[PDB]
């Protein structure tokens, strides 16, 4: 059963099709929180303190949002950005909302002897200590990528829903214990 | 402290456009502005909100001049 510790989501990624043409320079000019820098990259970035997130707007009618803790919060942040864009004078719409990625982390509160794990799971558990302290493990059900550390913490990424993170954690836990 | 007041007055003047921020200061990169925001928000979210509300007239020469003067003053007095 669980050790009483539930994985905690740390970032959520979502995007929408705005459905209208936009001008990067106009948005940069008319918005307080907009940042624009075509000499480096041709896109406008966006920031709001609630939900705490960073987003980008593109002239093609696209938006990406990240930094939220939950998928509903990322959708709220994205809709706030769409509201700002609409009130800036652009006929934007909230079309084709999708969640791309979300990151979670957890802990087991015991030391991890990584050498045994790499010696029993080398096929998928990529361990290399030199360049990077943490172990890297990719597993299939679902298609998640994991990072593992000696202190007992774990980082999980590549999921779309929190159920995937929970399932992956529950599957790995017996392997972590032994 | 005075440099903190400068980020606050800048972002009041122009908003949270870290690229233009880092350009106007002489040796502060955008990453430094981001790190400073990430440090200060917890205690100065109120000041960030006030600055967002404080849409101060952003003049090029006025701000460049007051910058140069107060940097010189701080360097001399520090």
């Amino acid at each position: 059963g669980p050790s009483g510790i539930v994985p905690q989501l740390q970032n959520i990624v979502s995007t929408v099709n705005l459905g209208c043409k936009l001008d990067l320079k106009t948005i940069a000019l008319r918005a307080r929180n907009a940042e624009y820098n075509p000499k480096r990259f041709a896109a406008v970035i966006m920031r709001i303190r609630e939900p705490r997130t960073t987003a980008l707007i593109f002239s093609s009618g696209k938006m990406v949002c990240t930094g939220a803790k939950s998928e509903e919060q990322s959708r709220l942040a994205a809709r706030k950005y769409a509201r700002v864009v609409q009130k800036l004078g652009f006929p934007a719409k909230f079309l084709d909302f999708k969640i791309q990625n979300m990151v979670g982390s957890c802990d087991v509160k015991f030391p991890i002897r990584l050498e045994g794990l790499v010696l029993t799971h080398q096929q998928f558990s990529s361990y290399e200590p030199e360049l990077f302290p943490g172990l890297i493990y990719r597993m299939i059900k679902p298609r998640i990528v994991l990072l593992i550390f000696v202190s007992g913490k774990v980082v999980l990424t590549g999921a779309k829903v929190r159920a995937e993170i929970y399932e992956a954690f529950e599957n790995i836990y017996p392997i972590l214990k032994g | 402290n005075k440099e903190t007041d400068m980020f606050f007055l800048a972002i009041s003047m122009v908003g949270t456009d870290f690229s233009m921020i880092g350009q106007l200061f002489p040796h502060r990169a955008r990453i430094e502005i981001k790190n400073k925001f990430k440090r200060e928000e917890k205690t100065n979210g109120w000041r960030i909100d006030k600055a967002f509300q404080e849409k101060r007239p952003f003049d090029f020469d006025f701000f460049a001049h007051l910058l140069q003067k107060v940097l010189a003053e701080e360097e001399k007095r520090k």
Side-chain angles (χ1 to χ4, degrees), chain A residues 34-103:
Chain A
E35 318 87 355
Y36 184 42
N37 173 16
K39 301 180 185 175
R40 290 287 292 177
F41 186 62
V44 170
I45 312 95
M46 264 278 144
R47 311 179 197 275
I48 65 189
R49 281 176 295 291
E50 63 294 337
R52 288 182 170 75
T53 54
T54 313
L56 270 83
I57 328 305
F58 314 85
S59 56
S60 61
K62 308 293 170 84
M63 162 290 307
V64 311
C65 182
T66 174
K69 297 299 188 184
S70 96
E71 57 267 50
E72 324 91 309
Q73 302 334 290
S74 48
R75 198 175 72 86
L76 173 56
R79 291 190 309 91
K80 288 181 172 205
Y81 292 122
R83 284 293 312 293
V84 174
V85 167
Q86 285 171 338
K87 220 165 182 65
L88 286 172
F90 299 96
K93 297 99 180 172
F94 227 76
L95 321 174
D96 175 19
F97 176 81
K98 52 231 164 287
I99 173 150
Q100 297 75 45
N101 196 34
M102 27 162 269
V103 177

Side-chain angles (χ1 to χ4, degrees), chain A residues 28 31-37 47 49 52, chain B residues 12 15-18 48-49 51-52 54-55:
Chain A
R32 292 279 279 156
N33 89 78
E35 318 87 355
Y36 184 42
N37 173 16
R47 311 179 197 275
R49 281 176 295 291
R52 288 182 170 75
Chain B
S12 308
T16 184
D17 194 345
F18 291 177
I48 296 298
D49 292 5
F52 271 60
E54 188 177 329
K55 299 175 189 175

Side-chain angles (χ1 to χ4, degrees), chain B residues 6-46:
Chain B
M6 280 324 317
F7 325 112
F8 282 114
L9 186 61
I11 74 83
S12 308
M13 272 265 291
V14 58
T16 184
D17 194 345
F18 291 177
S19 68
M20 181 36 48
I21 313 322
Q23 167 276 344
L24 72 96
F25 313 76
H27 67 69
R28 297 299 189 186
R30 170 264 162 208
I31 48 155
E32 303 180 59
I33 310 314
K34 170 62 194 295
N35 198 17
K36 182 61 180 189
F37 174 99
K38 173 43 166 82
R39 306 335 302 126
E40 65 80 43
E41 162 50 33
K42 52 189 68 62
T43 56
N44 288 302
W46 64 268

